[PDB]
Amino acid sequence: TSIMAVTFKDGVILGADSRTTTGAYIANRVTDKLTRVHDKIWCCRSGSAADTQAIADIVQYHLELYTSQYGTPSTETAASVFKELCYENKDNLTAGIIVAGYDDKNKGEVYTIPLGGSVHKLPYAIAGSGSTFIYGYCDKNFRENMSKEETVDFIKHSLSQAIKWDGSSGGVIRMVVLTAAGVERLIFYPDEYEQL
């Protein structure tokens, strides 16, 4: 996997590749690693496909039950539920999750949750095997309060390089845009991003 989430002026954008592997065989070349846990709280999944799915399903259940009682949860609250599961079951899980959401008060927020189950709130986050190859690029090119189009280009160029160097990453580049306007899904095919 190569995944990332980036905050910007109007909110936050999640990005991911579409490759699922079993050794060197690509079990799924059109995977959707960007998953909804609430209307405007989504997550990027890396690590075990089984573990991350089971976790995301439980979180979605918790946040649905939260909403029934206490109304819309914060992105911090969602990240806390993810953490609780990842930390307390750290011995049996292989999950690297990035939580991203849009509040009206707090705007765009990004929380990353590595293997140990620690939580880290950041302006932007990168994760997955392919992230290693773009630490240098992303650090040099990221700016706060970018526009939607700039953020889309930043994610596109970044994941393009991650995909280029990482054999465990590839396929299409999926993106999910979270703003006050709503939820927008984006897709970008090889013929476009490869020749960037």
Binding site: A24, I26, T35, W165, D166, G167, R185
Partner: protein
């Protein structure tokens, strides 16, 4: 006792009515890292043979040097080096097959899988495989690594047995090879889009094609796929 470091993935090939086709991508992987992108894994020997190599690249470069030296050695005191006493595909293969088996028998193998494709002096098609263990076999279609699992099934739909070879044209055969390379790009995590392809014909001779790309890919249906089960958005 070795472990391969910089590696090359599948090599695929097949026979057709007048000759043989062989192909392999231009990638030199370093584990999961797709490190080197300008690697040529098809190596011509003379104007009638092409050796396709997968596996360890350092050992591939060693084999290149052996084949290059073989051509030099054959020319020594040989007035018919470019005629009757030129190197045949069968000669080149048997040499490599001898080396591979000797190296495995010394517990120090050349960590490769090799396919020697060519046309003999009498016009007969030559296509034979050899690997790090010294194991050899021949078939109308041959492939290494993932190609064995994914390409062979596709190529065998064209040439399922010996009698299908005269019925298969170079246009049909090349089409199948190029299609197979696309499928490997879809499904092999250590493959690249860029590849080389070689045709050895008994009439038109050796045609070596570089810098080919996988094209006419299907990705559009991906936009319709959402979530992993229930998710609607």
């Amino acid at each position: 006792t070795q472990q391969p470091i910089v590696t090359g993935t599948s090599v695929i090939s097949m026979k057709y009515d007048n000759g043989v086709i062989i192909a392999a991508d231009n990638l030199g992987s370093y584990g999961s890292l797709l490190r080197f992108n300008g690697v040529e894994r098809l190596i011509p020997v003379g104007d009638n043979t092409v050796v396709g190599i997968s596996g360890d690249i350092s050992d591939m470069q060693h084999i290149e040097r052996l084949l290059k030296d073989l051509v030099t050695e054959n020319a020594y005191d040989n007035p018919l080096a470019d005629a009757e006493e030129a190197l045949e595909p069968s000669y080149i293969f048997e040499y490599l097959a001898t080396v591979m088996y000797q190296r495995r028998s010394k517990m120090n193998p050349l960590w490769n899988a090799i396919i020697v494709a060519g046309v003999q002096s009498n016009g007969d098609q030559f296509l034979r495989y050899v690997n790090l263990l010294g194991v050899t076999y021949s078939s109308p279609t041959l492939a290494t690594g993932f190609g064995a699992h994914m390409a062979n099934p596709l190529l065998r739909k064209v040439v399922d047995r010996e009698s299908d070879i005269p019925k298969t044209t170079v246009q049909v055969a090349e089409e199948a090879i190029v299609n197979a390379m696309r499928v490997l790009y879809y499904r092999d995590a250590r493959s690249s889009r860029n590849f080389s392809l070689a045709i050895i014909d008994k009439n038109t001779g050796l045609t070596f094609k570089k810098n080919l790309q996988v094209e006419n890919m299907k990705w559009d249906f991906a936009k319709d796929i959402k979530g992993y089960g229930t998710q609607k958005i």
